[PDB]
Amino acid sequence: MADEEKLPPGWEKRMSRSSGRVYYFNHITNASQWERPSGNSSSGGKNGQGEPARVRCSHLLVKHSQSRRPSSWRQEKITRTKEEALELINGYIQKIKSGEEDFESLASQFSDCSSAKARGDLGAFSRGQMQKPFEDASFALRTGEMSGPVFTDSGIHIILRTE
Numbered sequence: 001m002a003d004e005e006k007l008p009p010g011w012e013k014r015m016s017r018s019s020g021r022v023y024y025f026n027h028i029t030n031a032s033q034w035e036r037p038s039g040n041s042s043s044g045g046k047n048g049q050g051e052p053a054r055v056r057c058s059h060l061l062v063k064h065s066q067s068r069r070p071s072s073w074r075q076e077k078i079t080r081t082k083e084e085a086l087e088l089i090n091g092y093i094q095k096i097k098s099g100e101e102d103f104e105s106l107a108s109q110f111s112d113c114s115s116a117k118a119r120g121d122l123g124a125f126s127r128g129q130m131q132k133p134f135e136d137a138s139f140a141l142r143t144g145e146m147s148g149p150v151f152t153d154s155g156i157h158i159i160l161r162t163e
Contacts, residue, residue, distance in 0.1 A: 001045070064156060073114070092106055
């Protein structure tokens, strides 16, 4: 229902008798209960809530010289410089966003991470499972959107929300 973000006439916060519990009471009708009552006026319905508890996104890991662990099935000692790093991730954004290089086949062929198994597609996860910057950017993008260069533990990652 309404977003109840106020206290109209009659409603007043009070503490329990000789106690320390705080509640809400309305003298207009002598009401008494927890949680906010109304929302100033009366009519309210500008809420939302809900949203999917999980999301399906794909990504492309491209370690660099500053990678905490420059090594994977793609290479033994990764050392992608600043330009080399973004050069890959960025270039990948162009082709993919253009529809020439499918992120799926793209990530896999360049997925420095074990994501290759799913061509970068990490699958349906829950907000708070993957890296903080990952989840945020991931959960911050729209359906079919691709994130930019994300510098995390390994290196630069590119996210692409599927659904």
